[PDB]
């Protein structure tokens, strides 16, 4: 596939006693934050408590989003992990509180137990009866296995699934009752008189033997928000994909909560809560914070993880300054995991891991110079330089990045400090904040 920014992190790298290894599972260093994230991971996996807010704070390029991705990969399958940014709340058709309510309800999964029946066998005779216009449809199907042969009755959807994906006599099909899905497995009769209309080359499969009808228990996970969108109006299943779910009323949410509790009380369904991750949470209005402070106190509330790389700055919607850009009421009900800057050995290990993921054979001195330029400049610049150095290296037709290609890539592409150094001595060439510029060279 393709290579992403955190593609080397699949897990958190923790032992059975929640103690981090120095270099494991794509993560190196940051022992205290990894231990705290493992504690939060087990807190999610217990599923006994709700509505706890966790704040991750630190300087930029430290591993906050890396920690969130490690938590998400250690979470495992069929557990909801909603990852949003702070800028997506502001919408033209939804209120901020409604968007936050939907983002909260996306992170709660409901695991529904269902009982199905599977039917497989050769088709003997299909009879389909239709109206003159074509609306009313009914018919009988004669399916057959080696031992048994029964006749069934068909409805509108079953005939629709029979007509598309064309079934003739002699084909072997598999029917699932609760899902309404018809799959053709192949053909067995090999009919001689074939009207040459299609270019079918259907597979030769064997006769299915044994019981015609078999029962099985299936499990699927649905979200809470999907249940509100489905029950909201007549065609809500389209609105699940088009996003045209405009301000679902409170009565729907109350009745859905009551029916979810009723399904839990019988054993059909169980509640699997998840993690809602809000990156750049400081990019939020104070009304959003006031809603979050009281939406964290509900029964159906996920564990909320927030990330900030901001100090004592202005809180949006107000005219005062607060720590992390957040009001003190939200900071009262949050526990805070802090993150610290890196060393030279950690930066070298990060660059070696990212070179192993991107399949680049780096030399020793090239790695030393990349570590040097990653400890003077930032880590992300030296991480970005590796692919460019590789593409320069294949121009000379050798599959090993030397220090010459790294030096050429450092010459061709600039850092932020070199850019501000070049800008600040040529201020007439660039457009001023007052809009003045010099275009003529003489």
């Amino acid at each position: 596939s393709l290579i992403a920014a955190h593609s080397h992190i699949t897990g958190l790298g923790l032992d059975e006693n929640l103690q981090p290894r120095p270099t494991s599972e794509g993560m190196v260093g940051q022992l205290q934050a990894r231990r705290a994230a493992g504690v939060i991971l087990k807190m999610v996996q217990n599923g006994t408590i709700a509505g706890r807010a966790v704040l991750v704070a630190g300087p930029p390029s430290t591993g906050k989003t890396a920690l969130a991705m490690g938590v998400s990969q250690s979470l495992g399958k069929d557990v909801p992990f909603t990852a949003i940014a702070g800028s997506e709340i502001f919408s033209l058709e939804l209120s901020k509180t409604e968007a936050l309510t939907q983002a909260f309800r996306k992170s709660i999964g409901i695991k529904i137990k269902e009982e199905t029946e599977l039917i497989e066998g050769e088709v003997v005779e299909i009879q389909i009866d239709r109206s003159i216009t074509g609306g009313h449809k009914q018919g009988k199907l004669t399916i057959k296995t080696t031992d048994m042969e029964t006749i069934y009755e068909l409805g509108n959807k079953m005939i629709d699934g029979l007509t598309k994906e064309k079934v003739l006599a002699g084909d072997v099909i598999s029917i699932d009752k609760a899902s309404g899905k018809i799959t053709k497995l192949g053909r067995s009769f090999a009919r001689s008189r074939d009207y040459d209309a299609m270019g079918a080359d259907t597979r030769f499969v064997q006769c299915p033997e044994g019981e015609l009808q078999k029962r099985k228990t299936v499990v699927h996970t649905v979200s809470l928000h999907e249940i509100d969108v489905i029950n909201s109006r007549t065609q809500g299943f389209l609105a699940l994909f088009t996003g045209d779910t405009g301000e679902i009323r409170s009565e729907v949410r109350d009745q859905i909560n009551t029916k979810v509790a009723e399904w839990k009380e019988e054993g059909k369904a169980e509640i699997v809560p998840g993690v809602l991750f809000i990156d750049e949470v400081h990019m939020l209005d104070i009304e959003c914070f006031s809603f979050i402070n009281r939406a964290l106190e509900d029964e159906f509330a996920p564990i909320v993880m927030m990330a900030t790389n901001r100090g004592v700055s202005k809180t949006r919607g107000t005219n005062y300054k607060s720590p992390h850009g957040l009001p003190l009421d939200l900071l009262d009900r949050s526990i805070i995991i802090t993150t610290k800057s890196y060393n030279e050995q950690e930066i070298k290990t990060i660059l070696s891991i990212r070179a192993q993921e991107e399949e680049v054979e780096l030399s020793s001195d090239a790695l030393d110079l990349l570590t040097k330029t990653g400890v003077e400049t930032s880590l992300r610049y030296s991480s970005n330089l590796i692919s460019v150095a590789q593409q320069i290296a294949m121009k000379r037709k050798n599959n090993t990045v030397e220090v010459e290609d790294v030096k050429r890539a450092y010459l061709l592409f600039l850092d932020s400090a070199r850019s501000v150094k070049y800008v600040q001595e040529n201020e007439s060439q660039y457009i001023d904040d007052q809009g003045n510029v010099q275009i003529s060279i003489a």
């Binding site: 929640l18 205290q32 231990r35 705290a36 087990k42 807190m43 217990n46 599923g47 006994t48 408590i49 709700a50 509505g51 706890r52 704070a57 630190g58 300087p59 033209l92 058709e93 939804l94 209120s95 509180t97 029964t150 006749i151 069934y152 009755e153 509108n156 959807k157 079953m158 009752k177 609760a178 109006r233 065609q235 405009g246 301000e247 409170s250 009565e251 509640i271 009304e287 959003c288 006031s290 809603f291 402070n293 009281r294 939406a295 106190e297 509900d298 029964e299 509330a301 100090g311 004592v312 720590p323 992390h324 003190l328 009421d329 009262d332 526990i335 805070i336 995991i337 610290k340 800057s341």
Partner: protein, 443 residues
């Protein structure tokens, strides 16, 4: 076993028969005068005589205002409608904030009606339509009547339908051998399922098989329903439920909040008063709870000043943690608790108090015994000193990481070392701010 979130150790105000609060009752510790005032408010609501009474719960953070409102709702019971709300909910992109406030006002008033339903039901035996003499005449439909024969346990009736009921019957996709349910108030048809008198193992439509309904075909049954006034207003403004084309096309459109006029509200009030006069309905006024009331604008406060003077208004409970603070939407109006002086005159302020060290210790005790955790005495004293030093809430939610760290060492005891590790792994606001000040690049 169960799931707990920041509450549900509170089961009520926990008063006596005379209105005197005990020290530890209903999960409450302290706050005696606030609980007695809330009990007086509960008695006033249960009297069912007053309209437009507003109280304000004013105190600091973590002093138990939302807990008191939850205790009000638990003491009143599930019959009385309780409408929790935050101040940021009123800013909607579909309709103005004034209409959202009035919608919540009408949503806070309940009703209880005993309704009689005329019901035809049974298993469909014969379904035979009759045709028209000129079906392409432009006016008039294709058929004229449809004969439907229904049978029940000790009963069989044959009905002659006009086409309009048959259109709903056809939309329900009924056939011969199905158990149906026709109600005559709105013409709605419910198809129950296949009758059990035939074979049940020859279908592919995952349908369930019911037996014949007992009794006759034509019944009149009594149903007790609990509705609000906002449900009546919403049902009248967007009409669905009839069998006319406006009603069928009303279900297919995307719903949208509109500005309900005062004329519809007066007519709904007149119909409800006529229902009450017949001994059919009864009125259950309720409570509207608005949290973070300082988030409202000056226009919403000015509309609240007029909405409280109506004759059908519920009891409104507000909460705020603000001192001398400018009102939002104004630049110079400094008012107590962020609430303008025109609203404070129509209010009764209930003041909440901060806690003591022993109250913090026993609150941590109930929160530990609700989360199914056992702690030591020295760890409890450390948690109480920690709650006095930093915050009550920070001591409250440090319990679960302590329990996880106790579990991971194969013990069922929370000790001092687990609390020290929870201090080392998780910070509070003060230590994070102290890290932020002594930092290079906003660490």
């Amino acid at each position: 076993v169960t799931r707990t979130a920041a509450h549900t150790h509170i089961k009520g105000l926990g008063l006596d028969e005379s209105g005197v609060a005990k020290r530890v009752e209903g999960g409450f510790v302290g706050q005696i005068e606030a609980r007695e005032a809330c009990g007086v408010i509960v008695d006033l609501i249960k009297a069912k005589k007053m309209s437009g009474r507003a109280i304000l719960l004013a105190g600091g953070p973590s002093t138990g205002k939302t807990a008191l409102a939850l205790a009000i709702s638990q003491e009143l019971g599930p019959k009385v409608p309780f409408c929790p709300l935050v101040g940021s909910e009123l800013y909607s992109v579909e309709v103005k904030k004034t209409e959202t406030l009035m919608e919540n006002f009408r949503r806070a008033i309940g009703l209880r009606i005993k309704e009689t339903k005329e019901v035809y039901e049974g298993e469909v035996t014969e379904l035979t339509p009759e045709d028209a003499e000129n079906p392409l005449g432009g006016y008039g439909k294709t058929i004229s009547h449809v004969i439907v024969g229904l049978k029940s346990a000790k009963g069989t009736k044959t009905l002659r339908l006009d086409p309009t009921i048959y259109e709903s019957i056809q939309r329900e996709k009924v056939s011969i051998g199905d158990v149906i349910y026709i109600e005559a108030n709105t013409g709605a048809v419910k198809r129950v399922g296949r009758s059990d008198a035939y074979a049940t193992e020859f279908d592919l439509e995952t349908e369930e098989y019911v037996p014949l309904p007992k009794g006759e075909v034509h019944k009149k049954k009594e149903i007790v329903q609990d509705v609000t006034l906002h449900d009546l207003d919403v049902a009248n403004a967007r009409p669905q439920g009839g069998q006319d084309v406006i009603s069928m096309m009303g279900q297919l459109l995307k719903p949208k909040k509109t500005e309900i006029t005062e004329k519809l509200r007066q007519e709904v009030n007149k119909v409800v008063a006529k229902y009450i006069d017949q001994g059919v309905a009864e009125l259950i006024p309720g409570v509207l709870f608005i949290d973070e009331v300082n988030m409202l604008d000056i226009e919403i406060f000015t509309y609240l000043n007029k909405a409280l003077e109506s004759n059908i208004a519920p009891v409104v409970v507000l909460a705020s943690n603000r001192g001398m603070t400018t009102v939002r939407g104004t630049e110079d109006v400094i008012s107590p608790h962020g609430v303008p002086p025109d609203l404070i005159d129509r209010l009764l302020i209930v003041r909440t108090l901060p806690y003591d060290k022993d109250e913090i210790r026993t609150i941590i005790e109930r929160r530990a015994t609700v989360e199914r955790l056992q702690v030591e005495s020295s760890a409890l004293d450390l948690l109480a000193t920690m709650g006095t030093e930093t915050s009550l809430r920070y001591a409250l939610q440090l319990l679960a990481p302590c329990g996880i760290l106790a579990q991971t060492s194969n013990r069922k005891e929370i000790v001092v070392n687990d609390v020290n590790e929870a201090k080392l792994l998780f910070l509070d606001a003060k230590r994070s701010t102290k890290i932020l000040e002594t930092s290079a690049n906003y660490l």
